[PDB]
C-alpha cells in the first residue's frame, strides 16, 4: 500500500509517515552503534503508540476555527504563506509585549527574535514582581521556533539563499531546536521530541549520505516536521489552559 | 517481547511489565537435576510460541504463525525480457 491501489482518499501531509517503513525493517548490518540505537528507539515509540490507542470522542462539534468563523469579528481572505508567517510573528510579539507592559515590567525587553532580557540589574522586589512563569515562556519559545522557520522562508524569498540551502536550513532548525530554542527548560518532556528528531536524523543521514560523504546538504525535513506538528497537537490544550 | 521482558537484538526494550520476581520460589519442579538440556531455549522461541516456552505468559498476544513462501519473480532487465518468461532461478520441468 498505496501502490497496489488506483483510487483513494487524500491524507494530510503530516499523516504520510515517509521514514516509518525504514525502522520497521531490519537496519543494514554495517551501520555504527548510534544509528542502530536510533532505529531501536524509534521502534520503541512505534510500539508504545500501538499498545495504547487513545480513541477519539464522537461529540466533538466545536472546532476552534469553524466556531470563530461563525462570528462577525473574524473574516476570511487569502494571502501568501510567508506573509501569514510574518503577520503571526508581529502579532505574537505584540501579544507578549502587551502582556509584559500591562504587568508593568517595562524593565524587561523582548527581542524581535523572542529572547527576554532585563534592561537593568533588578531589585529583589522587581525580581519577585517580574517572575514570569512557564506559560509565558512556553508561548515565547514556540513563537521563537516559528520565527526561525518563517525567517528561513523570508531569506529564500529575498533571494539571499537558494532552494537547497532553504531545505537544509529547515532540516537543521527542526533537528537543532534543542540548541536554538531552549524550550526544554519550561517543559522537559519535549526531550522526547528532540530525541526522536536526533534518531530520525541518524537514520535519514545514513540513508542519504551513502557514497556522498560528509558536509551539509541534507534537506529531507519531513519526519522531524511531523514530530513537531504532533507535539503541537498535544501542546494546544495545555497552553490554552 | 514487552510482556515477557525479552528482547531480541535490534528490537526495542522496555522496563518489565511485572517488576516483581518470585524470590520465594525454591521448588524441585525445574531443578537442573531433572531438566534435560539439549538445545538452549532462545528468546526467539519465547516470542514465537509464547505459551509453550514461558511459564507465566501473562498478557501475551498470539502471533501470526506463517505465510506461504514467497515466489514472486521480478523482471530484472530493461526491455529485452518480456512480462512472462522462465526466470533462471526456476527449476526446469523435465517430465514428459
Amino acid at each position: 500500500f498505496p501502490f497496489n491501489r488506483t483510487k483513494g482518499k487524500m491524507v494530510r501531509a503530516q499523516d504520510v509517515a515517509l521514514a516509518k517503513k525504514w525502522f520497521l525493517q531490519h537496519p543494514d548490518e554495517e551501520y555504527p552503534v548510534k544509528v542502530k540505537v536510533s532505529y531501536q528507539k524509534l521502534l520503541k515509540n512505534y510500539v508504545l503508540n500501538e499498545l495504547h490507542p487513545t480513541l477519539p470522542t464522537n461529540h466533538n462539534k466545536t472546532k476552534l476555527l469553524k466556531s470563530l468563523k461563525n462570528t462577525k469579528y473574524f473574516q476570511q481572505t487569502t494571502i501568501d504563506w510567508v506573509e501569514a508567517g510574518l503577520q503571526l510573528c508581529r502579532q505574537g510579539h505584540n501579544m507578549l509585549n502587551l502582556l509584559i507592559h500591562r504587568k508593568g515590567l517595562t524593565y524587561l525587553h523582548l527581542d524581535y527574535n523572542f529572547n527576554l532580557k532585563p534592561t537593568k540589574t533588578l531589585t529583589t522586589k522587581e525580581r519577585k514582581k517580574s517572575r514570569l512563569g512557564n506559560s509565558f515562556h512556553l508561548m515565547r519559545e514556540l513563537l521563537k521556533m516559528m520565527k526561525l522557520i518563517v525567517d528561513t522562508h523570508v531569506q529564500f524569498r529575498l533571494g539571499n539563499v537558494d532552494a537547497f540551502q532553504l531545505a537544509d536550513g529547515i532540516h537543521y532548525i527542526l533537528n537543532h531546536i534543542g540548541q536554538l530554542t531552549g524550550i526544554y527548560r519550561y517543559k522537559y518532556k519535549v526531550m522526547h521530541q528532540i530525541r526522536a528528531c536526533k534518531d530520525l536524523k541518524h537514520i535519514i543521514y545514513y540513508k542519504f549520505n551513502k557514497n556522498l560523504g560528509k558536509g551539509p546538504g541534507c534537506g529531507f525535513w519531513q519526519p522531524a516536521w511531523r514530530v513537531w506538528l504532533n507535539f503541537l497537537r498535544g501542546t494546544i490544550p495545555l497552553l490554552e489552559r | 517481547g514487552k510482556a515477557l521482558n525479552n528482547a531480541i537484538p535490534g528490537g526495542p526494550k522496555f522496563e518489565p511489565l511485572y517488576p516483581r520476581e518470585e524470590e520465594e520460589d525454591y521448588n524441585e519442579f525445574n531443578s537442573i537435576d531433572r531438566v534435560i538440556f539439549r538445545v538452549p531455549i532462545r528468546s526467539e522461541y519465547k516470542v514465537a510460541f509464547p505459551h509453550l516456552y514461558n511459564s507465566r505468559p501473562r498478557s501475551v498476544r498470539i502471533p501470526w504463525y506463517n505465510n506461504p513462501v514467497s515466489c514472486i519473480i521480478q523482471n530484472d532487465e530493461e526491455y529485452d525480457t518480456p512480462a512472462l518468461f522462465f526466470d533462471p532461478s526456476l527449476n526446469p520441468i523435465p517430465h514428459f
Partner: peptide, 22 residues
C-alpha cells in the same frame, strides 16, 4: 553486482543518484 538503473557497480537501485528510468 551493479546498479541496474545506471550500470555502476556497488550501490543498489534504491541508493542510486540518477533518476529512475523505465
Amino acid at each position: 553486482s551493479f546498479c541496474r538503473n545506471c550500470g555502476e557497480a556497488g550501490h543498489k537501485e534504491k541508493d542510486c543518484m540518477e533518476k529512475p528510468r523505465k
